[PDB]
Design a protein around this motif. Structure first.
Motif, PDB file in Angstrom:
ATOM      1  N   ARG A 113      35.121 -12.702  39.032  1.00 46.81           N
ATOM      2  CA  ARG A 113      33.909 -13.509  39.229  1.00 46.81           C
ATOM      3  C   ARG A 113      34.201 -15.015  39.118  1.00 46.81           C
ATOM      4  NH1 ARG A 113      30.043 -15.345  41.180  1.00 46.81           N
ATOM      5  NH2 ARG A 113      27.896 -15.526  40.327  1.00 46.81           N
ATOM      6  N   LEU A 114      33.969 -15.765  40.198  1.00 45.48           N
ATOM      7  CA  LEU A 114      34.352 -17.174  40.270  1.00 45.48           C
ATOM      8  C   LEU A 114      33.260 -17.951  40.992  1.00 45.48           C
ATOM      9  CD1 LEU A 114      37.843 -16.354  41.418  1.00 45.48           C
ATOM     10  CD2 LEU A 114      37.613 -17.918  39.526  1.00 45.48           C
ATOM     11  N   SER A 115      33.239 -19.273  40.812  1.00 46.25           N
ATOM     12  CA  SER A 115      32.147 -20.068  41.377  1.00 46.25           C
ATOM     13  C   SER A 115      32.477 -21.547  41.238  1.00 46.25           C
ATOM     14  CB  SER A 115      30.814 -19.749  40.670  1.00 46.25           C
ATOM     15  OG  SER A 115      29.746 -20.493  41.217  1.00 46.25           O
ATOM     16  N   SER A 116      31.885 -22.370  42.106  1.00 39.08           N
ATOM     17  CA  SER A 116      32.124 -23.798  41.969  1.00 39.08           C
ATOM     18  C   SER A 116      30.952 -24.608  42.499  1.00 39.08           C
ATOM     19  CB  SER A 116      33.422 -24.238  42.671  1.00 39.08           C
ATOM     20  OG  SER A 116      33.449 -23.807  44.002  1.00 39.08           O
ATOM     21  N   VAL A 117      30.784 -25.791  41.925  1.00 37.12           N
ATOM     22  CA  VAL A 117      29.625 -26.629  42.200  1.00 37.12           C
ATOM     23  C   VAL A 117      30.039 -28.073  41.949  1.00 37.12           C
ATOM     24  CG1 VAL A 117      28.786 -26.142  39.866  1.00 37.12           C
ATOM     25  CG2 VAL A 117      27.220 -27.111  41.532  1.00 37.12           C
ATOM     26  N   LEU A 118      29.560 -28.973  42.789  1.00 38.77           N
ATOM     27  CA  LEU A 118      29.777 -30.397  42.593  1.00 38.77           C
ATOM     28  C   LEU A 118      28.549 -30.978  41.905  1.00 38.77           C
ATOM     29  CD1 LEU A 118      32.042 -32.586  43.598  1.00 38.77           C
ATOM     30  CD2 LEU A 118      30.120 -33.419  45.056  1.00 38.77           C
ATOM     31  N   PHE A 119      28.766 -31.726  40.825  1.00 38.95           N
ATOM     32  CA  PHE A 119      27.712 -32.462  40.125  1.00 38.95           C
ATOM     33  C   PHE A 119      27.865 -33.957  40.420  1.00 38.95           C
ATOM     34  CE2 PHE A 119      28.378 -28.698  37.271  1.00 38.95           C
ATOM     35  CZ  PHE A 119      27.154 -28.087  37.507  1.00 38.95           C
ATOM     36  N   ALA A 120      26.918 -34.520  41.183  1.00 36.46           N
ATOM     37  CA  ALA A 120      26.966 -35.920  41.611  1.00 36.46           C
ATOM     38  C   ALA A 120      26.134 -36.812  40.689  1.00 36.46           C
ATOM     39  CB  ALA A 120      26.473 -36.061  43.053  1.00 36.46           C
ATOM     40  N   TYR A 121      26.771 -37.858  40.143  1.00 35.80           N
ATOM     41  CA  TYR A 121      26.180 -38.813  39.210  1.00 35.80           C
ATOM     42  C   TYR A 121      26.241 -40.212  39.795  1.00 35.80           C
ATOM     43  CZ  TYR A 121      26.826 -35.385  35.366  1.00 35.80           C
ATOM     44  OH  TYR A 121      26.794 -34.261  34.563  1.00 35.80           O
ATOM     45  N   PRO A 122      25.255 -41.053  39.501  1.00 32.88           N
ATOM     46  CA  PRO A 122      25.424 -42.485  39.764  1.00 32.88           C
ATOM     47  C   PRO A 122      26.346 -43.091  38.715  1.00 32.88           C
ATOM     48  CG  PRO A 122      23.407 -42.137  38.557  1.00 32.88           C
ATOM     49  CD  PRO A 122      23.996 -40.765  38.788  1.00 32.88           C
ATOM     50  N   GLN A 123      26.629 -44.382  38.824  1.00 32.17           N
ATOM     51  CA  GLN A 123      27.446 -45.031  37.812  1.00 32.17           C
ATOM     52  C   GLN A 123      26.702 -45.023  36.482  1.00 32.17           C
ATOM     53  OE1 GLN A 123      29.104 -48.873  39.276  1.00 32.17           O
ATOM     54  NE2 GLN A 123      31.020 -47.688  39.230  1.00 32.17           N
ATOM     55  N   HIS A 124      27.427 -44.676  35.415  1.00 30.57           N
ATOM     56  CA  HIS A 124      26.805 -44.484  34.114  1.00 30.57           C
ATOM     57  C   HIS A 124      26.196 -45.783  33.605  1.00 30.57           C
ATOM     58  CE1 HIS A 124      28.530 -40.401  32.689  1.00 30.57           C
ATOM     59  NE2 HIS A 124      28.474 -40.430  34.009  1.00 30.57           N
ATOM     60  N   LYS A 125      26.823 -46.921  33.953  1.00 29.56           N
ATOM     61  CA  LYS A 125      26.435 -48.229  33.434  1.00 29.56           C
ATOM     62  C   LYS A 125      25.291 -48.874  34.222  1.00 29.56           C
ATOM     63  CE  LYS A 125      30.046 -51.050  35.840  1.00 29.56           C
ATOM     64  NZ  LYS A 125      29.141 -51.898  36.648  1.00 29.56           N
ATOM     65  N   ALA A 126      24.983 -48.386  35.433  1.00 30.68           N
ATOM     66  CA  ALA A 126      23.828 -48.857  36.194  1.00 30.68           C
ATOM     67  C   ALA A 126      22.524 -48.578  35.451  1.00 30.68           C
ATOM     68  CB  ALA A 126      23.797 -48.188  37.572  1.00 30.68           C
TER      69      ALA A 126
ATOM     70  N   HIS B 223      35.554 -19.514  35.981  1.00 30.92           N
ATOM     71  CA  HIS B 223      36.384 -18.293  36.102  1.00 30.92           C
ATOM     72  C   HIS B 223      35.715 -16.999  35.628  1.00 30.92           C
ATOM     73  CE1 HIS B 223      39.367 -15.320  34.719  1.00 30.92           C
ATOM     74  NE2 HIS B 223      39.855 -15.482  35.945  1.00 30.92           N
ATOM     75  N   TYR B 224      34.720 -17.015  34.758  1.00 35.75           N
ATOM     76  CA  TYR B 224      34.130 -15.679  34.448  1.00 35.75           C
ATOM     77  C   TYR B 224      32.607 -15.702  34.520  1.00 35.75           C
ATOM     78  N   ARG B 225      32.031 -16.541  35.377  1.00 33.86           N
ATOM     79  CA  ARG B 225      30.559 -16.697  35.469  1.00 33.86           C
ATOM     80  C   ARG B 225      30.252 -17.607  36.653  1.00 33.86           C
TER      81      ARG B 225
ATOM     82  N   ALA C 132      41.797 -18.961  39.667  1.00 33.41           N
ATOM     83  CA  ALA C 132      41.929 -17.714  38.916  1.00 33.41           C
ATOM     84  C   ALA C 132      43.388 -17.438  38.555  1.00 33.41           C
ATOM     85  CB  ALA C 132      41.333 -16.562  39.729  1.00 33.41           C
ATOM     86  N   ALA C 133      44.302 -17.588  39.522  1.00 39.40           N
ATOM     87  CA  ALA C 133      45.725 -17.450  39.206  1.00 39.40           C
ATOM     88  C   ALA C 133      46.155 -18.444  38.131  1.00 39.40           C
ATOM     89  CB  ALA C 133      46.568 -17.623  40.472  1.00 39.40           C
ATOM     90  N   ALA C 134      45.727 -19.704  38.254  1.00 38.28           N
ATOM     91  CA  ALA C 134      46.143 -20.701  37.271  1.00 38.28           C
ATOM     92  C   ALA C 134      45.627 -20.362  35.879  1.00 38.28           C
ATOM     93  CB  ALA C 134      45.668 -22.092  37.683  1.00 38.28           C
ATOM     94  N   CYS C 135      44.454 -19.729  35.783  1.00 36.60           N
ATOM     95  CA  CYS C 135      43.902 -19.392  34.470  1.00 36.60           C
ATOM     96  C   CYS C 135      44.781 -18.416  33.713  1.00 36.60           C
ATOM     97  CB  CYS C 135      42.481 -18.819  34.603  1.00 36.60           C
ATOM     98  SG  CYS C 135      41.218 -20.093  34.964  1.00 36.60           S
ATOM     99  N   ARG C 136      45.626 -17.644  34.405  1.00 35.38           N
ATOM    100  CA  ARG C 136      46.508 -16.683  33.747  1.00 35.38           C
ATOM    101  C   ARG C 136      47.949 -17.169  33.609  1.00 35.38           C
ATOM    102  NH1 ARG C 136      44.625 -13.689  30.957  1.00 35.38           N
ATOM    103  NH2 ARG C 136      46.173 -12.013  31.232  1.00 35.38           N
ATOM    104  N   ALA C 137      48.281 -18.359  34.112  1.00 37.80           N
ATOM    105  CA  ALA C 137      49.652 -18.856  34.109  1.00 37.80           C
ATOM    106  C   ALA C 137      50.053 -19.421  32.748  1.00 37.80           C
ATOM    107  CB  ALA C 137      49.824 -19.956  35.148  1.00 37.80           C
ATOM    108  N   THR C 138      51.371 -19.455  32.507  1.00 39.01           N
ATOM    109  CA  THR C 138      51.941 -20.108  31.335  1.00 39.01           C
ATOM    110  C   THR C 138      53.017 -21.143  31.651  1.00 39.01           C
TER     111      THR C 138
END
Ligand SMILES: O=C(O)CCC(=O)C(=O)O
Ligand SMILES: [Cl-]
Ligand SMILES: [Fe+3]
Length: 265
Positions: A230-243, A162-164, A58-64
């Protein structure tokens, strides 16, 4: 929508005993998938790490001194793969395994915002161990001869927002980390909506994604969910794209022509 308390009820999985505690939590996790459609574990100390990460994002989203300097279209991307980097506006970042390994210049956003980046790498590593063992639990619920999920470190990414609307992930598994606020809701097998009590807790939720729905040939529906005050985070795990894809149809392992990359397109 009814609240679903999970603190003190989901199996406990300690940061320095993940493999053994997940082994012990296996039966509880299976029963969550069978009975809810998503899974849950309490991870003592994860909430502190995720809150710090989110608050620094959130802090980084407002930095310059600026995150849009690392928008996806100016960040080096893998030739085959998804798209890491910052997505301006509701605004979010994709921190991939590749990015954490600097795969070169792709790690520059983390060098520019190294306080956020250090937390994100830490939370990525924890979440990726958790989710890989969640995947082993789900695999053990599948017929004998089911291949390993083979989640890819480089192709997996951590999203920080950052906003959802009702939706599921396209990938193999998602790991919802505790959000700043309440509102995330899940649908049960009977079509009713519940609101897990997870804001400011140590509880993580593990989502079935559409890749695993396909690999299990419909056995496990996607862990469909939505966000509703309002902040949130989630990991999306994928196999190798080329498999090449696979699928367990009526107990038989079938190797398909298309790749996992084709599944996304
Ligand atoms: O905004 C949130 O709290 C969670 C959003 C979501 O559905 C996800 O990260 O998969
Ligand atoms: Cl999702
Ligand atoms: Fe989602």
């Amino acid at each position: 929508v009814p609240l679903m308390e999970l603190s003190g009820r989901a199996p406990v999985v300690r940061l320095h005993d993940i493999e053994a505690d997940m082994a012990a939590a296996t039966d509880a996790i299976r029963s969550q998938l069978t009975g809810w459609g998503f899974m849950a574990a309490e991870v003592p100390g994860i909430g502190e790490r995720v809150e710090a990460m989110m608050n620094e994002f959130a802090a980084a989203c407002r930095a310059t001194g600026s995150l849009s300097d690392y928008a996806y279209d100016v960040v080096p991307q893998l030739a085959v793969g998804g798209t890491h980097g910052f997505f301006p506006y509701k605004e979010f970042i994709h921190v991939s395994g590749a990015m954490i390994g600097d795969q070169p210049g792709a790690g520059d956003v983390l060098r520019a915002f190294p306080a956020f980046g250090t937390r994100a790498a830490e939370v990525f590593d924890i979440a990726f161990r958790l989710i890989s063992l969640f995947g082993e639990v789900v695999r053990g619920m599948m017929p004998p001869g089911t291949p390993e999920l083979d989640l890819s470190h480089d192709a997996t990414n951590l999203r920080v927002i950052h906003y959802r609307h009702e939706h599921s992930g396209i990938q193999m598994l998602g790991l919802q980390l505790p959000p700043s606020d309440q509102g995330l809701q899940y649908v049960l097998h009977d079509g009713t909506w519940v609101e897990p009590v997870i804001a400011g807790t140590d509880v993580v939720l593990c989502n079935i994604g559409r890749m695993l729905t396909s690999a299990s040939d419909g056995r496990f529906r996607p862990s469909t969910h939505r966000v509703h005050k309002r902040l949130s985070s989630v990991l999306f795990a994928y196999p190798q794209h080329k498999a090449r894809q696979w699928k367990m149809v009526d107990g038989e392992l079938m190797s398909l022509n298309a790749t996992w990359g084709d599944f996304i397109d």
